[PDB]
Design an enzyme around this catalytic site. Sequence first.
Site, mmCIF file in Angstrom:
data_model
loop_
_atom_site.group_PDB
_atom_site.id
_atom_site.type_symbol
_atom_site.label_atom_id
_atom_site.label_comp_id
_atom_site.label_asym_id
_atom_site.label_seq_id
_atom_site.Cartn_x
_atom_site.Cartn_y
_atom_site.Cartn_z
ATOM 1 N N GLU A 1 12.699 10.342 4.510
ATOM 2 C CA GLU A 1 11.288 10.359 4.224
ATOM 3 C C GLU A 1 11.159 9.950 2.777
ATOM 4 O OE1 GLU A 1 10.750 11.236 7.884
ATOM 5 O OE2 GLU A 1 8.966 11.886 6.763
ATOM 6 N N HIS B 1 0.885 -1.144 0.000
ATOM 7 C CA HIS B 1 0.000 0.000 0.000
ATOM 8 C C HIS B 1 0.936 1.210 0.000
ATOM 9 C CE1 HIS B 1 -2.240 3.225 1.914
ATOM 10 N NE2 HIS B 1 -3.375 2.580 1.713
ATOM 11 N N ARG C 1 2.346 8.150 7.148
ATOM 12 C CA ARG C 1 0.931 8.512 7.061
ATOM 13 C C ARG C 1 -0.002 7.441 7.642
ATOM 14 N NH1 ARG C 1 -0.409 13.045 3.732
ATOM 15 N NH2 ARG C 1 -2.522 12.408 3.155
ATOM 16 N N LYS C 2 0.550 6.279 7.986
ATOM 17 C CA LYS C 2 -0.238 5.197 8.557
ATOM 18 C C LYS C 2 0.205 4.899 9.988
ATOM 19 C CE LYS C 2 -3.289 3.944 5.418
ATOM 20 N NZ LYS C 2 -3.165 5.048 4.425
ATOM 21 N N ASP D 1 10.472 10.525 18.856
ATOM 22 C CA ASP D 1 9.238 10.112 18.171
ATOM 23 C C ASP D 1 9.124 8.587 18.071
ATOM 24 O OD1 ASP D 1 7.881 12.508 15.861
ATOM 25 O OD2 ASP D 1 9.089 12.943 17.654
ATOM 26 N N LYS E 1 13.805 6.798 10.827
ATOM 27 C CA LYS E 1 14.408 7.542 11.946
ATOM 28 C C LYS E 1 15.271 6.653 12.883
ATOM 29 C CE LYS E 1 10.612 10.915 12.205
ATOM 30 N NZ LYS E 1 9.406 11.370 12.974
ATOM 31 N N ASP F 1 1.425 4.249 1.100
ATOM 32 C CA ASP F 1 1.849 4.832 2.380
ATOM 33 C C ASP F 1 2.771 3.930 3.193
ATOM 34 O OD1 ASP F 1 0.602 7.360 2.207
ATOM 35 O OD2 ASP F 1 -1.324 6.552 2.921
ATOM 36 N N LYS F 2 2.744 2.624 2.927
ATOM 37 C CA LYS F 2 3.500 1.617 3.676
ATOM 38 C C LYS F 2 4.707 1.080 2.886
ATOM 39 C CE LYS F 2 2.409 1.115 7.080
ATOM 40 N NZ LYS F 2 3.646 1.250 7.900
ATOM 41 N N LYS G 1 15.856 10.361 17.623
ATOM 42 C CA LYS G 1 14.531 10.945 17.385
ATOM 43 C C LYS G 1 13.533 10.227 18.286
ATOM 44 C CE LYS G 1 16.898 12.688 13.897
ATOM 45 N NZ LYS G 1 18.185 12.340 13.217
ATOM 46 N N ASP H 1 -1.654 7.213 -7.879
ATOM 47 C CA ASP H 1 -1.580 7.423 -6.447
ATOM 48 C C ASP H 1 -0.606 8.499 -6.014
ATOM 49 O OD1 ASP H 1 -2.686 6.229 -3.945
ATOM 50 O OD2 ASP H 1 -2.792 4.443 -5.227
ATOM 51 N N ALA H 2 -0.625 8.735 -4.707
ATOM 52 C CA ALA H 2 0.492 9.317 -3.992
ATOM 53 C C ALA H 2 0.683 8.468 -2.744
ATOM 54 C CB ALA H 2 0.200 10.753 -3.630
ATOM 55 N N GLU I 1 17.449 14.316 5.776
ATOM 56 C CA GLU I 1 18.730 14.642 6.378
ATOM 57 C C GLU I 1 19.407 13.419 6.973
ATOM 58 O OE1 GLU I 1 15.736 15.719 7.806
ATOM 59 O OE2 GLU I 1 15.561 17.231 6.212
ATOM 60 N N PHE J 1 -9.586 -5.069 -8.781
ATOM 61 C CA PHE J 1 -8.531 -4.290 -8.139
ATOM 62 C C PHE J 1 -7.183 -4.686 -8.764
ATOM 63 C CE2 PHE J 1 -7.975 -1.758 -4.176
ATOM 64 C CZ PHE J 1 -6.593 -1.742 -4.091
ATOM 65 N N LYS K 1 -5.727 -4.058 2.155
ATOM 66 C CA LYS K 1 -6.300 -3.240 3.234
ATOM 67 C C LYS K 1 -7.388 -4.054 3.968
ATOM 68 C CE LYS K 1 -10.006 -1.496 3.038
ATOM 69 N NZ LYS K 1 -11.174 -1.160 2.165
HETATM 70 MG MG MG Z 1 6.180 13.031 12.462
#
Ligand code: MG
EC number: 2.5.1.6
Lengths: 361, 381, 309
Positions: free
Chosen positions: B43, B15, B250-251, B277, B271, B17-18, B275, B244-245, B56, B236, B167
Site C-alpha cells: 500500500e 493524480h 481510493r479510486k 479482491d 496485490k 490517489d493514482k 487476494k 495533498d494526501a 506485508e 493549476f 481529472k
Molecule cells: Mg480493499
Amino acid sequence: EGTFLFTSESVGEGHPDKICDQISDAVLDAHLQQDPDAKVACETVAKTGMILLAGEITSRAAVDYQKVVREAVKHIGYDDSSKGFDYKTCNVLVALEQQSQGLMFGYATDETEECMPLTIVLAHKLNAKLAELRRNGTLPWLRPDSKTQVTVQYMQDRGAVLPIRVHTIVISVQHDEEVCLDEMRDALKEKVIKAVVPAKYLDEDTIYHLQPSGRFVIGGPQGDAGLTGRKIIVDTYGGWGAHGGGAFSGKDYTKVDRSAAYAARWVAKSLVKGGLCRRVLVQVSYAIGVSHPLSISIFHYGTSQKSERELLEIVKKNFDLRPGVIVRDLDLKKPIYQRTAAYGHFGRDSFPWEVPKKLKY
Amino acid sequence: EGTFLFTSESVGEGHPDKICDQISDAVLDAHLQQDPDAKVACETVAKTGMILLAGEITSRAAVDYQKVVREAVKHIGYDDSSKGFDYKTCNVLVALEQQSPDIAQGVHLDRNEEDIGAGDQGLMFGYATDETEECMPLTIVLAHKLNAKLAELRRNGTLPWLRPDSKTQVTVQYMQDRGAVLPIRVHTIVISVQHDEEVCLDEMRDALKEKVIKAVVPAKYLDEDTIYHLQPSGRFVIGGPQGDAGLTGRKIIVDTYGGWGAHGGGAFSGKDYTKVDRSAAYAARWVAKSLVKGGLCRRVLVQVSYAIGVSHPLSISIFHYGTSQKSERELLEIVKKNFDLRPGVIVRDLDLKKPIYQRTAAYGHFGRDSFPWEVPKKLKY
Amino acid sequence: IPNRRVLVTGATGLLGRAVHKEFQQNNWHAVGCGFRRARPKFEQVNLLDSNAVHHIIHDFQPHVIVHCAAERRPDVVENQPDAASQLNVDASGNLAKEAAAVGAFLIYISSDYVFDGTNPPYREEDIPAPLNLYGKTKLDGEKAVLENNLGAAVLRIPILYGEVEKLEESAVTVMFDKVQFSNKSANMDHWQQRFPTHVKDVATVCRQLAEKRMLDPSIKGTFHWSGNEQMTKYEMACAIADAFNLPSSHLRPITDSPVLGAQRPRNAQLDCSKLETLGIGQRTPFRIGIKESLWPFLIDKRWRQTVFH
Ligand SMILES: [Mg+2]
Ligand SMILES: Nc1ncnc2c1ncn2[C@@H]1O[C@H](CO)[C@@H](O)[C@H]1O
C-alpha cells in the site's frame, strides 16, 4: 426457482482500514467543536505500531492529535502489546498541512426495518454484537479485529426483493492463543449468530464459515495495513444500490461526496417509509455552475404505481438539495461523525438523514 | 421518454490517489520478475514530498524499494521542484513487514496451488455491456481515453506544456432498451489538467478541444449543444502530491466500471492473485464479457463471494438485466459448466503471475487491449 | 469499407432497421436516415425538405435507395390527411426525382392495402382498388415513383412483424400483453385474413432484388412479396401464446367484420410468383420469428429490465 443469492460484508471497529476511518472522523470532530467552519480532509494510515495522519486542514481549533489518536485507539480496545497494538506505546506521526461536478446515490429498501438490505445489516449487526460481548466481558478471548459476511437467498418479485433465508455466514474474528478452535465456533453460533440473525431465516441447510482461517491471533495493523476510505461499500449499501466513489470519513460537510450522500439517502428513506415505493435508487447529478442538482433520476424498480415523473415532482416540493440547505436540515456541523465511521453510515436510527421526512405531496 | 444522464470520472497518471495505485503495482511487478509466487500487499501513501510504503510482502525476490518507487515516479513524470514533486529528491519511507503467518497457514502453505484458499473474504462483481465494442460503459471508457490522450501528447511531445495531474468527467445522455442502455449523446465534458506557467487558458482550451477531445470522442456523439468545461476553475500548478494526501486504492470506481454495475469494496492495486479482491474481480469481468460477446445477454452483472481459506467460492449470482432470452438460472448453470473460479485455477486461466500489473493502475483495469481477462471464452452449452 | 452504396430511409423504423442491417452485414456501405431520432446511429433528414434530401443524395452517390419511411398506421392517415399524403406520395416523388437524377435504383416499399381483397390471391399486374386512405396513399406513392423514375421498383408487402423495441411498432406485436394476461379475457378479430411477414425476410428480398439489378437492368417495375402462413389477428394471438407456452383461452374469437371493416380489405393476399420465379425470397416460420421478436416483452423479463440491480 426465480430466486438468487446476494452476499454483503462488514468489518468490526478494530479492522485496521476502519480504525483509520474512525480516527479520521475523530480528528474532524476535534476541529468542529472549536471551529464549526473548519475545513478538513484527513487520511489515516495504520501499521504495526504506527498511526500516521496526512493531508490538508484549514481551521481555528488547535487540536492535541496525540490525544485524539490515542483516546480513539483505546476506545476501539487496543490496550496491550499482547494484541498487536496499544494506544499507550504506538508511534503517532503527524504530517498535516494546516493554515487558517458530482454524482451521488441514495438507496432504500423495505426488506428490513432499517430500510437497508438484509445482507449488510446482519453483517453489520454480527460485528456490533461481538464488540458488545468483548466490552461487557462475556467473551473475554475476543480481540477488536473482525469481519462478517452474510449471503442471503432472495426472491425477486414485482420489483422488490424478499429475503427468504440466510444461505452462508462467514465470521472471522481475532482471538487469543489460550482458547481452542472449537469453543469459538460453538460460541459464534450460539452467543453471536443466534443473537443477531432472526430464528426464522436459519435452518439445517444454512452454512457456517466460522474462523475458516484456523488461527487468527495476529491481527489489526500488525496483520494488514490500514488506510482511510477503504470500506466505501461497507460504509454504504454493501453490494446493493450504486456508488460514486466518495469516501466519507475524514472529510467534512463542505465535500458534497459526504453531505449529499446523506441527503440522497435521506430522500430515499423518506420515499420507502412514506409508502411511495417499496425499493428505490436516487441518482442526483450535480453540475459545475449550478448549485442545484442538474438532474435527478428515480429508479423505483417498478415497485410504485406513481410514475418516475411523479416521484421526481414529490421530491422538488419536499426537499432542497443545494449543499447550503442540507447543512442546515441535517445539522452537519455537529461534531458527531466518529459514530458513523463504523457499523455503516446509512441504516441507524440515531442520524439526521435516517429520520424520514414526512412527505406532504 | 425514459432517458437518463450518467457520469463517470477518471483521473490520470499523476493524480495522487493514482500514483499510489501505480507505485504499489510497480512494487508488485518488482517481486514477480524474481519470485512469481510472491505474497504482496503493498500500500502506498503520497503526501507533499513523501512516498510511504506500508504492508506485508513475503518473497524470495530481492528488491530495491528506493529504485522501484522512484523509477515509477520518474515514469509518471514528476522531476522538478517547479512541478510539485521530484523523483530525485522525494522522501521514501519503507514500513514493510512479512505476511501474517496465521494467514499463510490458513490460505496457501502446505497446499497444492490449485487447492489454495481465498486470500481473505469479500465480494466482487463483473459487469459487461454491448454499448461499446470494448464492452464497457461509454462514460468511463471516454473518461479514460481523454486522460490517456493527454499523456500520449504530453509524452510524445506534441503538447509539452502539460503535466501528469488530470481529472476528466464525462456526462452521457442515455436511453433504455429492453434492459440494455443506449448512449445517445455526450451532454457534458470536463477536463481539469496540470500545466506549466508559460501558457494562456485560451490556447490550452483550444488545444484540449481539437487535439484531444475531438480525436477521442467520436463525432457522432458530439453536437453543438454538448457542453465543454475546459480548465474549469482556471490555473493549476498546485498539482500532484503538493498540498495533498494520496492513498493506494481510493479510486476503485474509476479503476472499474465508472459507477455502473456494482462494486464490493475491493482495492485492486498492490496485490497478487491470492487476494481475491483482484483475481476474482478479473475472473468476474472475464465471465460477464464472455456472456455478452458469446451473445447470450446484452448486459450483465455477476457476483462472486469467497471466505478466507476456502477455494470453492461461497456464492455465485447472475443478473442479466432482462436482456437474455435464457433465465438467470440458465446462465448461472452455463457459468458453472464453463468457468472454475478458485484462485488456484484463475491464476492459470488469466495468467496472474506475470509482472504487467502496473499497466492497469491507470486508465482502468477493464475494457482494454491485450489483458487476459478481456479475451472472451468460447462457451459450450 | 465496401464499394456498393445503399441509402435506407426510415431506418429508425422497424423495417428500415432490418434493411440497413441486412445490406450492411452482406458487404455494402449502408447509410440510414430518419427524422424521428436518427442520431447517433443514423443521419437526420426531414424527407419533406427538398435540399435536406437532395444534399445527402448528391453527397453520397448511392446506387440503390430503399424507401421505408411513411405514415403506416391506417387510422392516423384519416386523422391528418394533409400530412399523410405529403410524406407517402410527395416525399416518394421528390425521392424518385433525385433517385433517377443520380442514376439510383429506388425501391419504394408499398402495401397490400392498395387492393380490396374481394378476389385473392392478387398478382402484380391486377387492378388496384383500395378501400381506405392509407391504401390509396401507398398507391399514389407508386405512381409518383414510377412517373419520376422508369426502372424504380415497387415492392408490395403485407402486415409486418419483427424484432421490435416497442410493441406498437407492429400490429402483430401489440397483442402481446393481451396474450400474456391469461386472467383478463380479450377479444380478437377472426374475420380479416392476414399474412404476417418478418421484416428481416423483407430486407433479404430487398437486397436480393437490388443486387440482381446491378447486373440486369431489366429488373424493375412492381413486385409482391409475402410470408405464406395465413392467419387472422386471432390466430396470430394463439400461435404467439403457443410459441411462448402460454394458454390461449381467455382469447374470444370475434368473427364479424369490424364496424369500420367494409373499409378494410378482407383477403388482400399477394401472389409472389413474379419474384419466386427469379428465385428471390426468404420465409422465416412465423412460429420461430415471433418467438425471436417478443421474448424481450415477456413480463418476467420486462420486470428485470431496469438500469441497476
Ligand atoms: Mg480493499
Ligand atoms: N489469520 C487471519 N485469519 C482470518 N482473517 C484475518 C487474519 N488476519 C487478518 N485477518 C483479517 O483479514 C484482513 C487481511 O486479510 C485483515 O484486515 C483482518 O481484518
